[PDB]
């Protein structure tokens, strides 16, 4: 388990509220304020989920072998409703769980926090609180998505089981990625914020 995690008294799941003004909080807040500087941050939590981390790291090691390079991970954003937050913290992102799915039936992740900050995604709750994850995503080798995909396309129609790792809206200048498998995304931080 990562060095920057804090001790969990022999437990496997903890949400740790970050200390404002320390390097870790500052780094995550800056990623958010790059595009969401008009919002108000209530708190940032580090998600320490040993099981989800384990499964994700196995997939990363496999994708690093398959792709023969270690440039397969991106840090992306995911806005969701308050009622989904406990599920994501414990189980991560589930493609089987309203919004447009124009690039395929997977879990969507934004390059810019401002996109995930839309009320359609980070739905404000009874109190006006909005919720956005900072997510480690194994985007790997990607291609343009399209409606109705249930997996990424093959890299070559001649070898139909050798797949792209993810899809995007635009390969030259991506603003969203879609992944189609359990444990290709690790929810690393939860930002609680208002407009």
């Amino acid at each position: 388990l990562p060095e920057h995690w804090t001790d969990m008294n022999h437990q496997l799941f903890c949400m740790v509220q970050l200390e404002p003004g320390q390097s870790e909080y500052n780094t995550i807040k800056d990623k958010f304020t790059r595009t969401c500087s008009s919002y108000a941050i209530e708190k940032i939590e580090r998600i320490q989920n040993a099981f989800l981390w384990q499964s994700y790291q196995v997939k990363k090691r496999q994708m690093d072998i398959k792709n023969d390079h270690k440039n397969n991970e991106r840090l992306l954003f995911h806005g969701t409703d308050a009622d989904s937050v406990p599920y994501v913290n414990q189980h991560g992102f589930n493609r089987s769980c309203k919004n447009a799915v124009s690039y395929g039936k997977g879990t969507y992740f934004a390059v810019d926090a401002s996109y995930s900050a839309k009320d359609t995604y980070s739905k404000p709750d009874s109190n006006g609180r909005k919720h956005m994850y900072v997510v480690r995503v194994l985007t790997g080798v990607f291609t343009k998505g399209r409606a109705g995909l249930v997996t990424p396309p093959p890299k070559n129609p001649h070898n139909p089981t050798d797949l792209f790792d993810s899809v995007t809206n635009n390969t030259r200048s991506p603003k969203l990625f879609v992944v189609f498998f359990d444990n290709q995304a690790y929810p690393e931080y939860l930002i609680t914020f208002t407009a």
Copy 2:
């Protein structure tokens, strides 16, 4: 990787044809013929898929820790069409590709206790040469309950703690004949039986 697998000389995938009279072949044939005595096996292949095995074994270890001393794994059957076999061999069972079952206990991947169920033409569709295809699958059934057609994940054990889930669902908890799983890497395709009438 299991020590009795063939050496794949650094390759990550291969299908190994088994020999009749070996215990490994005979136990699978016996498990199949217990309910499919009218069909005849062409061949049995051991599926050696390093990446699927790694991710499955991680999930098994997690479930064994979480459930504390449950037998979490069952050996079940899955009939499918020839067009799906390359994908399953490489990538396993994808709930997003699964058909609606004639009796639906949820939107997931279905596995049968009896080979006879998987042997129905509706699952193990005969190909253009009359070959039918059935996997023998290690499935992490864990702690289960009776499913419902509307499920896209197993239900919670307790409605006041919605994130603490059953591992799988079944048609009948007293006499299970099918199980449904809703997550990737909860089922390892271990053998492929090719068979005919």
